[PDB]
């Protein structure tokens, strides 16, 4: 159903977003409930709704071909796959719809954000940055002096897609705007390195304290940074079932890297060591120390974003609640102590 795929994608209309689901454009929509078969069409619906296609006279063949090439540029580790990218892109669309980004950022910045969302984890292998370095990967070999190893590769892969014949959805920009767009993507993608976020966190607080100034150029940069990290973590803004299930995949991925490190004779981080990792406290810590501050910062800049923070805080309480279930009380389901 692969070339079947390009053809349908291109020669039918692009569905109106509302026809996808009546709640497609609300903060309570879970993008991962859309069949993976429909997600490319969905990307195009959002692009058309956000008016970028008919704004920039983008080649529908080029655009549909971009989309499928982006999708195909993901591997299939448990977490860092296309459905991640898709729901991350979808949240960006939500932000643009519910928060009115056009009053905050230039059309080009928003386009670069959405597109960086599609591409921000391309060709991920289920290993992190410290793995690249520790294992002397060829990615660590090329990007050897400044960290953000994977993020540098994700941007590199996005670049190589745009430079594939019939995939340059930017080949309509002036050379000036083309450069600007590439520098935008690099910055937004790079911002998805958690180390980056921790570096600029103080500056984000400040901007939120004094208030976003649209004539401040450094505010534009910080906003786009905060918005992108809000997109990368948006699974935490949905239901309990979503955080629960996203913990499954995360930990499945992490533990595989740990098993591999052990085999190479490295010592894995605890959260990657399936023998040592206590998932409930790892989640609460992650929630309390990473994701919560992101959505609080977003609530401070954007008062309509408040429901998202309160979702994320409610998801944390719930890990607190079910946290006792990770000590086996009574007997296992089968009434057996064999597992001993
Ligand atoms: C930090 C390690 C904990 O990992 C996670 C644990 N629970 C949920 C989760 N959702 N995404 C992550 C995660 C996995 N790897 N990375 C790099 C992230 C992550 C983290 C932050 C950002 C904003 C800067 C972007 C991505 N998660
Ligand atoms: Mg990433
Ligand atoms: Zn990501």
XYZ file of C-alpha atoms and ligand atoms in Angstrom:
369
model
C 0.000 0.000 0.000
C 3.080 2.251 -0.522
C 2.645 3.788 -4.004
C -1.048 3.210 -3.712
C -0.172 5.710 -0.956
C 1.413 8.569 -2.843
C -1.403 8.396 -5.439
C -4.328 8.606 -3.060
C -2.533 11.213 -0.999
C -1.952 13.421 -4.075
C -5.016 12.991 -6.379
C -7.940 13.041 -3.904
C -8.633 16.264 -2.057
C -7.138 17.081 1.292
C -9.892 16.314 3.871
C -11.148 19.195 6.005
C -9.684 18.839 9.525
C -13.163 18.753 11.074
C -14.072 15.793 8.934
C -11.133 13.857 10.485
C -12.755 14.005 13.903
C -15.180 16.585 15.326
C -12.741 17.190 18.162
C -9.537 17.116 15.993
C -8.620 20.671 16.898
C -9.100 20.517 20.719
C -6.550 19.946 23.492
C -8.435 16.795 24.569
C -7.938 15.091 21.200
C -5.443 12.161 21.318
C -3.676 12.101 17.932
C -2.427 8.567 18.557
C -6.032 7.426 18.270
C -5.915 8.112 14.504
C -4.884 5.012 12.460
C -1.305 5.285 11.262
C -2.672 4.816 7.752
C -4.446 8.189 7.965
C -1.683 10.307 9.500
C -0.086 11.557 6.270
C -3.459 12.802 5.070
C -3.923 14.393 8.494
C -0.586 16.229 8.260
C -1.822 17.695 4.980
C -5.204 18.695 6.429
C -3.443 20.639 9.178
C -1.059 22.295 6.681
C -4.065 23.295 4.540
C -6.028 24.432 7.614
C -3.071 26.521 8.733
C -3.056 27.860 5.165
C 0.636 27.176 4.410
C -0.055 25.181 1.212
C -2.130 27.931 -0.491
C -0.031 30.646 1.185
C 3.371 29.546 -0.157
C 2.067 27.980 -3.393
C 3.680 24.707 -2.346
C 3.672 21.929 -4.912
C 1.020 19.472 -3.723
C 3.099 16.685 -5.401
C 6.211 18.046 -3.590
C 4.330 18.398 -0.260
C 2.665 14.991 -0.364
C 6.043 13.500 -1.404
C 7.743 15.412 1.497
C 5.306 13.969 3.999
C 5.765 10.338 2.920
C 9.517 10.724 2.827
C 9.456 12.169 6.383
C 7.267 9.266 7.601
C 9.640 6.789 5.944
C 12.644 8.411 7.565
C 11.596 7.092 10.929
C 12.582 3.636 12.169
C 10.375 1.700 14.569
C 11.736 1.715 18.086
C 8.939 1.520 20.673
C 8.730 5.269 21.386
C 10.716 7.352 18.859
C 8.866 6.494 15.736
C 6.539 8.224 13.239
C 3.504 8.196 15.544
C 5.567 10.199 18.002
C 6.440 12.718 15.262
C 2.839 12.789 14.162
C 1.331 13.557 17.559
C 4.142 16.096 18.194
C 3.206 17.831 14.859
C -0.447 17.604 15.799
C 0.193 19.411 19.109
C 1.947 22.177 17.230
C -1.220 22.483 15.153
C -3.266 22.613 18.374
C -1.014 25.406 19.702
C -1.494 27.404 16.492
C -5.288 26.857 16.665
C -5.977 27.347 20.357
C -3.295 29.883 21.282
C -3.427 32.064 18.115
C 0.246 31.919 17.217
C -0.103 34.347 14.317
C -0.316 37.130 16.910
C 3.019 36.044 18.370
C 5.199 34.760 15.572
C 5.783 35.350 11.871
C 4.159 32.951 9.395
C 7.612 31.644 8.504
C 8.428 30.812 12.128
C 5.242 28.831 12.585
C 5.894 26.957 9.311
C 9.417 26.150 10.490
C 8.033 24.980 13.873
C 5.460 22.602 12.342
C 7.934 21.230 9.911
C 10.667 20.814 12.562
C 8.079 18.824 14.579
C 7.627 16.385 11.678
C 11.396 16.001 11.359
C 12.685 16.426 14.917
C 13.488 12.736 15.652
C 14.160 11.458 12.089
C 16.092 8.204 11.810
C 16.125 7.779 15.586
C 17.492 4.344 16.594
C 16.126 4.080 20.155
C 19.445 5.123 21.693
C 20.218 8.459 23.321
C 23.091 10.909 23.134
C 25.319 9.395 25.783
C 25.057 6.073 23.954
C 26.335 7.707 20.723
C 29.340 9.079 22.596
C 30.101 6.052 24.821
C 29.834 3.676 21.834
C 31.794 5.955 19.448
C 28.995 5.879 16.902
C 29.593 7.392 13.458
C 27.101 10.076 14.489
C 29.305 10.981 17.467
C 32.242 10.842 14.979
C 30.788 13.560 12.781
C 29.227 15.770 15.484
C 32.083 15.519 17.885
C 32.588 18.844 19.640
C 29.299 20.294 20.985
C 26.770 17.607 21.987
C 23.215 17.358 20.647
C 24.519 14.457 18.573
C 21.125 12.905 17.625
C 19.482 16.336 17.181
C 22.286 17.284 14.723
C 21.514 14.043 12.855
C 17.716 14.652 12.885
C 18.382 18.035 11.260
C 20.863 16.485 8.827
C 18.201 13.937 7.803
C 15.610 16.718 7.312
C 18.110 18.598 5.083
C 18.690 15.447 2.964
C 14.958 15.011 2.493
C 14.418 18.617 1.314
C 17.334 18.024 -1.067
C 15.716 14.995 -2.631
C 14.243 15.754 -6.069
C 10.538 16.513 -5.773
C 10.738 16.922 -1.943
C 11.779 20.531 -1.562
C 8.739 22.211 -0.131
C 11.018 25.267 0.348
C 12.188 25.664 -3.244
C 9.724 28.590 -3.517
C 11.487 30.782 -0.895
C 13.988 33.454 -1.879
C 17.569 32.385 -1.210
C 17.321 34.737 1.771
C 14.170 33.019 3.117
C 15.468 29.594 2.270
C 18.491 30.200 4.529
C 16.331 31.709 7.218
C 14.105 28.623 7.141
C 17.079 26.238 7.450
C 18.560 28.172 10.312
C 15.099 28.090 11.964
C 14.861 24.290 11.667
C 18.347 23.813 13.051
C 17.554 25.960 16.055
C 14.114 24.394 16.758
C 15.349 20.824 16.266
C 18.424 21.498 18.437
C 16.107 22.793 21.117
C 14.722 19.286 21.477
C 17.904 18.278 23.311
C 16.980 18.225 26.975
C 20.464 19.580 27.724
C 19.569 22.609 25.587
C 16.354 23.127 27.520
C 18.122 23.024 30.893
C 20.562 25.652 29.619
C 17.904 28.213 28.609
C 15.406 27.468 31.375
C 16.359 30.574 33.390
C 15.962 32.775 30.257
C 12.560 31.217 29.649
C 11.447 32.100 33.229
C 12.628 35.669 32.694
C 10.682 36.132 29.439
C 7.559 34.739 31.171
C 8.143 37.094 34.135
C 8.593 40.249 32.021
C 6.204 39.039 29.296
C 6.662 38.087 25.624
C 7.665 41.071 23.508
C 7.003 40.460 19.809
C 9.604 43.085 18.853
C 12.222 41.327 20.895
C 14.132 38.958 18.582
C 15.472 36.868 21.419
C 11.912 36.324 22.617
C 11.024 34.860 19.246
C 13.899 32.349 19.707
C 12.910 31.456 23.257
C 9.208 31.136 22.381
C 9.940 28.742 19.526
C 12.149 26.791 21.890
C 9.520 26.499 24.575
C 6.773 25.661 22.017
C 8.837 22.882 20.481
C 9.625 21.269 23.844
C 5.886 21.580 24.665
C 5.271 19.624 21.483
C 7.906 16.910 22.190
C 6.202 16.255 25.650
C 2.531 16.729 24.673
C 1.602 13.073 25.452
C 1.699 14.152 29.035
C -1.194 16.595 28.448
C -3.746 13.960 27.454
C -5.345 11.223 29.639
C -3.855 8.941 32.281
C -4.083 6.114 29.776
C -1.791 8.039 27.439
C 0.982 8.731 30.043
C 0.688 5.117 31.152
C 1.065 3.821 27.631
C 3.855 6.287 26.751
C 5.743 5.071 29.853
C 5.481 1.491 28.466
C 7.149 2.459 25.171
C 9.713 4.826 26.716
C 10.869 2.194 29.156
C 10.803 -0.555 26.631
C 13.178 1.557 24.488
C 15.428 2.661 27.348
C 15.749 -0.849 28.745
C 16.912 -2.121 25.346
C 19.700 0.412 25.233
C 20.628 -0.664 28.766
C 20.714 -4.367 27.885
C 23.026 -3.453 25.008
C 25.337 -1.287 27.105
C 25.616 -4.127 29.676
C 26.565 -6.482 26.836
C 29.288 -4.041 25.687
C 30.491 -3.776 29.257
C 29.300 -0.266 29.916
C 27.248 0.576 32.962
C 23.827 1.899 32.044
C 22.037 4.814 33.680
C 19.544 3.466 36.215
C 16.392 4.495 34.230
C 17.757 2.289 31.431
C 18.612 -0.610 33.701
C 15.598 -2.879 33.782
C 17.009 -4.524 36.945
C 17.251 -1.250 38.893
C 14.571 1.028 37.398
C 11.527 1.896 39.488
C 9.187 3.259 36.862
C 6.677 5.137 39.130
C 9.306 7.406 40.774
C 11.052 7.941 37.465
C 7.769 9.212 36.024
C 6.938 11.500 38.970
C 10.440 12.920 38.916
C 10.219 13.388 35.161
C 6.776 15.006 35.533
C 7.749 17.176 38.457
C 11.146 18.239 37.222
C 10.822 18.410 33.396
C 7.339 18.429 31.957
C 5.495 20.447 34.628
C 7.815 23.450 34.441
C 7.407 23.457 30.651
C 3.623 23.656 30.809
C 3.739 26.197 33.704
C 5.989 28.438 31.626
C 3.465 27.930 28.822
C 0.548 28.760 31.108
C 2.387 31.912 32.222
C 2.863 33.155 28.666
C -0.453 31.801 27.389
C -3.424 31.891 29.780
C -5.476 29.581 27.468
C -2.696 27.006 27.921
C -3.682 26.551 31.628
C -5.753 23.379 31.089
C -2.574 21.675 29.766
C -0.512 22.280 32.921
C -3.430 21.112 35.089
C -3.612 17.933 32.957
C 0.094 17.365 33.389
C -0.185 17.971 37.173
C -3.176 15.606 37.353
C -1.188 12.973 35.485
C 1.523 13.233 38.131
C -0.886 12.722 41.056
C -2.105 9.561 39.295
C 1.448 8.024 39.169
C 1.574 8.813 42.867
C -1.623 6.878 43.329
C -0.872 3.747 41.344
C 2.689 3.769 42.540
C 1.969 1.250 45.301
C 0.879 -1.270 42.615
C 4.530 -1.819 41.738
C 4.965 -3.793 44.911
C 3.237 -7.098 44.386
C 0.567 -7.523 47.073
C -1.374 -10.701 47.454
C -0.490 -13.290 44.849
C 0.144 -12.683 41.119
C -2.822 -13.147 38.778
C -2.218 -16.886 38.382
C -2.151 -17.567 42.160
C 1.478 -18.612 41.837
C 4.865 -17.750 43.366
C 6.796 -19.302 40.480
C 8.049 -15.893 39.300
C 10.320 -16.347 42.374
C 14.593 12.834 30.218
C 14.464 11.334 30.185
C 13.045 10.907 30.491
O 12.389 10.438 29.317
C 11.027 10.501 29.293
C 10.326 9.987 30.369
N 8.991 10.079 30.370
C 8.309 10.618 29.356
C 9.016 11.124 28.264
N 8.576 11.725 27.131
N 9.712 12.031 26.346
C 10.767 11.633 27.087
C 12.185 11.713 26.517
C 12.806 10.510 26.210
N 14.006 10.801 25.638
N 14.049 12.192 25.561
C 15.284 12.721 24.955
C 12.943 12.772 26.032
C 12.706 14.214 26.090
C 12.719 14.853 27.318
C 12.484 16.225 27.347
C 12.242 16.936 26.177
C 12.009 18.425 26.227
C 13.368 19.065 26.465
C 12.261 16.274 24.958
C 12.475 14.907 24.921
N 10.372 11.045 28.242
Mg 14.678 13.918 20.135
Zn 10.781 13.741 20.257
